[PDB]
Design an enzyme around this catalytic site. Sequence first.
Site, PDB file in Angstrom:
ATOM      1  N   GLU A  60       4.728   4.939   2.169  1.00 21.35           N
ATOM      2  CA  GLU A  60       4.943   3.198   0.872  1.00 21.35           C
ATOM      3  C   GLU A  60       5.418   2.188   1.772  1.00 21.35           C
ATOM      4  OE1 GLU A  60       6.666   4.997  -2.375  1.00 21.35           O
ATOM      5  OE2 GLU A  60       4.702   4.920  -3.411  1.00 21.35           O
ATOM      6  N   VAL A  61       4.356   0.844   2.024  1.00 19.97           N
ATOM      7  CA  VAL A  61       4.578  -0.183   2.289  1.00 19.97           C
ATOM      8  C   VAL A  61       4.930  -1.051   1.618  1.00 19.97           C
ATOM      9  CG1 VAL A  61       3.835  -1.702   4.785  1.00 19.97           C
ATOM     10  CG2 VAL A  61       3.294   0.961   4.625  1.00 19.97           C
TER      11      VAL A  61
ATOM     12  N   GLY B  55       1.086  -1.210   0.039  1.00 20.06           N
ATOM     13  CA  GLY B  55       0.126   0.660  -0.008  1.00 20.06           C
ATOM     14  C   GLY B  55       0.710   1.270  -0.252  1.00 20.06           C
ATOM     15  N   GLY B  56       0.658   2.763  -0.414  1.00 21.47           N
ATOM     16  CA  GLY B  56       0.832   3.599  -0.114  1.00 21.47           C
ATOM     17  C   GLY B  56      -0.310   4.980  -0.117  1.00 21.47           C
ATOM     18  N   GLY B  57       0.671   5.431   0.666  1.00 21.88           N
ATOM     19  CA  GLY B  57      -0.102   6.907   1.000  1.00 21.88           C
ATOM     20  C   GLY B  57       0.621   8.600   1.625  1.00 21.88           C
ATOM     21  N   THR B  58      -0.154   9.166   2.540  1.00 18.15           N
ATOM     22  CA  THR B  58       0.765  10.273   3.423  1.00 18.15           C
ATOM     23  C   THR B  58       1.544   9.134   4.338  1.00 18.15           C
ATOM     24  OG1 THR B  58      -1.675  10.391   4.380  1.00 18.15           O
ATOM     25  CG2 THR B  58      -1.333  11.533   2.191  1.00 18.15           C
TER      26      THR B  58
ATOM     27  N   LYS C 214       8.565   0.163   5.546  1.00 19.52           N
ATOM     28  CA  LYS C 214       7.633   1.495   5.276  1.00 19.52           C
ATOM     29  C   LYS C 214       9.209   2.366   4.636  1.00 19.52           C
ATOM     30  CE  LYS C 214       4.353   3.124   7.559  1.00 19.52           C
ATOM     31  NZ  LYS C 214       3.627   3.564   8.975  1.00 19.52           N
TER      32      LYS C 214
ATOM     33  N   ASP D  37      -4.881   6.850  19.046  1.00 20.80           N
ATOM     34  CA  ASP D  37      -5.619   6.696  17.594  1.00 20.80           C
ATOM     35  C   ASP D  37      -5.662   5.537  17.465  1.00 20.80           C
ATOM     36  OD1 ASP D  37      -7.080   7.075  15.547  1.00 20.80           O
ATOM     37  OD2 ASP D  37      -4.773   7.818  14.573  1.00 20.80           O
TER      38      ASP D  37
HETATM   39  O1  LIG Z   1      -3.611  -0.531   2.378  1.00 28.50           O
HETATM   40  C1  LIG Z   1      -4.958  -0.926   3.303  1.00 28.50           C
HETATM   41  N1  LIG Z   1      -6.259  -1.221   3.502  1.00 28.50           N
HETATM   42  C2  LIG Z   1      -6.714  -0.673   1.629  1.00 28.50           C
HETATM   43  C3  LIG Z   1      -7.627  -0.784   1.908  1.00 28.50           C
HETATM   44  C4  LIG Z   1      -8.740  -0.778  -0.045  1.00 28.50           C
HETATM   45  N2  LIG Z   1     -10.384  -0.845   0.162  1.00 28.50           N
HETATM   46  C5  LIG Z   1     -10.502  -1.806  -0.142  1.00 28.50           C
HETATM   47  C6  LIG Z   1     -12.348  -1.379   0.191  1.00 28.50           C
HETATM   48  O2  LIG Z   1     -12.830  -0.537   0.063  1.00 28.50           O
HETATM   49  C7  LIG Z   1     -12.171   0.235   0.431  1.00 28.50           C
HETATM   50  C8  LIG Z   1     -10.655   0.775   0.199  1.00 28.50           C
HETATM   51  N3  LIG Z   1      -4.114  -1.530   4.421  1.00 28.50           N
HETATM   52  C9  LIG Z   1      -2.827  -1.461   4.950  1.00 28.50           C
HETATM   53  C10 LIG Z   1      -1.672  -1.180   3.795  1.00 28.50           C
HETATM   54  C11 LIG Z   1      -0.703  -0.967   4.504  1.00 28.50           C
HETATM   55  F1  LIG Z   1       0.653  -0.674   4.107  1.00 28.50           F
HETATM   56  C12 LIG Z   1      -0.822  -2.028   5.940  1.00 28.50           C
HETATM   57  O3  LIG Z   1       0.978  -1.516   6.784  1.00 28.50           O
HETATM   58  C13 LIG Z   1       1.250  -3.315   6.563  1.00 28.50           C
HETATM   59  C14 LIG Z   1       0.729  -4.573   6.078  1.00 28.50           C
HETATM   60  C15 LIG Z   1       1.801  -5.855   6.774  1.00 28.50           C
HETATM   61  N4  LIG Z   1       2.316  -5.574   8.023  1.00 28.50           N
HETATM   62  C16 LIG Z   1       2.327  -4.288   8.522  1.00 28.50           C
HETATM   63  N5  LIG Z   1       3.611  -3.930   9.836  1.00 28.50           N
HETATM   64  C17 LIG Z   1       3.074  -3.067   9.937  1.00 28.50           C
HETATM   65  C18 LIG Z   1       2.786  -2.157   8.994  1.00 28.50           C
HETATM   66  C19 LIG Z   1       2.758  -0.904   8.908  1.00 28.50           C
HETATM   67  F2  LIG Z   1       2.504  -0.083   7.826  1.00 28.50           F
HETATM   68  F3  LIG Z   1       0.964  -0.593   9.591  1.00 28.50           F
HETATM   69  F4  LIG Z   1       3.249  -0.032  10.047  1.00 28.50           F
HETATM   70  C20 LIG Z   1       1.911  -2.648   8.283  1.00 28.50           C
HETATM   71  C21 LIG Z   1      -1.656  -2.151   6.632  1.00 28.50           C
HETATM   72  F5  LIG Z   1      -1.582  -2.843   8.218  1.00 28.50           F
HETATM   73  C22 LIG Z   1      -2.590  -2.453   5.869  1.00 28.50           C
END
Ligand SMILES: O=C(NCCCN1CCOCC1)Nc1cc(F)c(Oc2ccnc3[nH]cc(C(F)(F)F)c23)c(F)c1
Lengths: 291, 287
Positions: A25-26, A19-22, A41, A132
């Site tokens: 990028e992960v 994923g990626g956003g503000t 990240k 949060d």
């Molecule tokens: O991008 C989304 N969802 C998008 C939803 C789209 N939708 C569909 C339905 O309709 C609406 C839109 N989730 C998400 C993305 C990430 F990059 C996450 O990061 C991780 C992942 C795995 N292991 C991790 N360990 C530490 C992290 C940390 F980066 F969080 F610190 C981390 C995470 F957890 C979740």
Amino acid sequence: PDIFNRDPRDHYDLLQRLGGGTYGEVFKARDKVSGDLVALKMVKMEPDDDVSTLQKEILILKTCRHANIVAYHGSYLWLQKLWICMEFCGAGSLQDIYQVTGSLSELQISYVCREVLQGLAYLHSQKKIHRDIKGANILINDAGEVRLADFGISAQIGAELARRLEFIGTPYWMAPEVAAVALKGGYNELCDIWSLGITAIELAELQPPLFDVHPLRVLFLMTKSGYQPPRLKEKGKWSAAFHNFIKVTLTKSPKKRPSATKMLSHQLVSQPGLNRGLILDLLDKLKNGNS
Amino acid sequence: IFNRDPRDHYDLLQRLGGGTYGEVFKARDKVSGDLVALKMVKMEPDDDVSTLQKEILILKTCRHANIVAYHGSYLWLQKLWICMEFCGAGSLQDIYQVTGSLSELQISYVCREVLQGLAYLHSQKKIHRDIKGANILINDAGEVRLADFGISAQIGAELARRLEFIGTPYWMAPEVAAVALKGGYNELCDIWSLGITAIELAELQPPLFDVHPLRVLFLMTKSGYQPPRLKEKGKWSAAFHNFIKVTLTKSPKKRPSATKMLSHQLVSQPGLNRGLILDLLDKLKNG
Ligand SMILES: O=C(NCCCN1CCOCC1)Nc1cc(F)c(Oc2ccnc3[nH]cc(C(F)(F)F)c23)c(F)c1
Ligand SMILES: O=C(NCCCN1CCOCC1)Nc1cc(F)c(Oc2ccnc3[nH]cc(C(F)(F)F)c23)c(F)c1
Ligand SMILES: O=C(NCCCN1CCOCC1)Nc1cc(F)c(Oc2ccnc3[nH]cc(C(F)(F)F)c23)c(F)c1
Ligand SMILES: O=C(NCCCN1CCOCC1)Nc1cc(F)c(Oc2ccnc3[nH]cc(C(F)(F)F)c23)c(F)c1
């Protein structure tokens, strides 16, 4: 070695952009030596960014450790990219999950709350506040285990920091007490307990209370002296213990709100049979459908 | 409020300044020929016209010479226009970036007028929150004006960024929400910001301007934080130095109110008048 003066690709193979956003990028990645999966990240540096301003946040990431908070493994700076290496949680956030599966059962919710309270009890013992707690910040790994996460250091550096400072008007004309609030003071760790109560409703009903009400109007209503703490909508669907858990976490006055340790003694999270098996059931539903 | 296109009533002359949080236009009234400033704010359907409707009534009712005059508002095409008094010289930052630093007398007059506007805003239970050279406006008569922007902060982009950076309310505890609503502080913050602005006008930069902004926030938090001071001691009178020291009081419970500061020798002396700023504008126009 606070931050590694190394390319993380020397130690890890990037497998997948998750994923990626503000928040940055992960990436899903594999340790080249151990074979462990991790999450990387990455945050892009601005020309004026100064990583030394992150020294105290990095020390906290190094010293705060608990099973129920995402594990920090190290940081890397290389070619204007700051990388944070963390524990991998393959099922994403609980928000990602219930948007596919639908509402969690009471016992799944009870297991999640217990695990979150364990994390919060530790954080609070270290005199830290999460600030949060919500479904989007509670991660689940493929073993069914529960890990607290946060927005992350991206708010302290990079383009996100620059956007925040523009919004507050920079700090140069700012009075000290305002500066204190801009760093998120003015309240204590018992706010996490209230937030957990809202999250339990969120896992039961697929949205927090008043989510269909304009955020400004919610703010107005929340701070009226007559404000009534929210409740679960469907009474008969949930046990007295669950209703009472919502009642006591959602105490308005912080001076009367129970601590994380006290909440860990609550019937709902103290009952037998709470284990990751409950979430393994949810993850099967997530991957293969209800039937 | 008017539910028309504002261009029915005004001719757009030129764009004076835009940005994430608004666009400002120089315009002329059709029936009267008067010059005005129009601030356009983009709205959402996700915005709430009830709240801004109430804030509109306050400006429509309450005046003060040192506050930019409110003339009318227009909602059209999900765009909110606020018609205001036009200030031909711009901001003090626009001026001193050309003229150089201000004299102590000119700063004394600016601080007096700003305090008068602040005393009024605080009496209305309002907080400016953004006092600085860039937000102190000057008209061609050399008079000093503050802009009341409270409306813009609860609609459009400003509201969205607030929700993004401070957070949505739905998971907030009530004590947390109360901080997020008012910003968590009091009106004496404007008195601190004015002290900094006085240094800004004297030196062309606020203190610590060359220092990383996050680091600046960290330093302000330290227990032994030392409030700034004017750099050149001998260039300024004792009254000015004491003005700085008093406005930059660390504890809000000891920082003087706007009314109390109008008693201060610096802003009480005779001879402070708009002629001092006419002198600044003449220097702007000629060499
Ligand atoms: O991008 C989304 N969802 C998008 C939803 C789209 N939708 C569909 C339905 O309709 C609406 C839109 N989730 C998400 C993305 C990430 F990059 C996450 O990061 C991780 C992942 C795995 N292991 C991790 N360990 C530490 C992290 C940390 F980066 F969080 F610190 C981390 C995470 F957890 C979740
Ligand atoms: O407390 C600060 N800075 C002080 C700022 C406030 N000061 C006082 C008030 O006024 C202004 C200054 N940082 C901080 C605190 C935490 F508790 C963190 O939690 C963790 C730590 C290690 N590993 C983790 N894994 C998952 C987490 C998760 F809890 F975030 F989910 C987590 C963290 F990362 C950073
Ligand atoms: O709004 C203003 N002044 C008038 C408007 C200026 N505008 C400039 C741009 O253009 C339009 C006019 N000051 C202000 C705004 C904020 F949001 C602040 O921050 C908080 C407060 C409470 N809790 C928080 N939690 C995280 C923050 C974080 F934002 F600091 F990250 C935060 C803060 F300290 C001061
Ligand atoms: O945009 C700039 N200068 C940019 C210079 C670029 N820089 C050069 C130096 O280096 C960096 C880049 N000035 C400016 C623009 C505006 F739109 C102003 O608004 C008004 C103007 C007139 N009358 C008004 N009446 C009410 C207002 C209110 F809109 F402010 F409320 C108002 C204002 F005051 C000043």
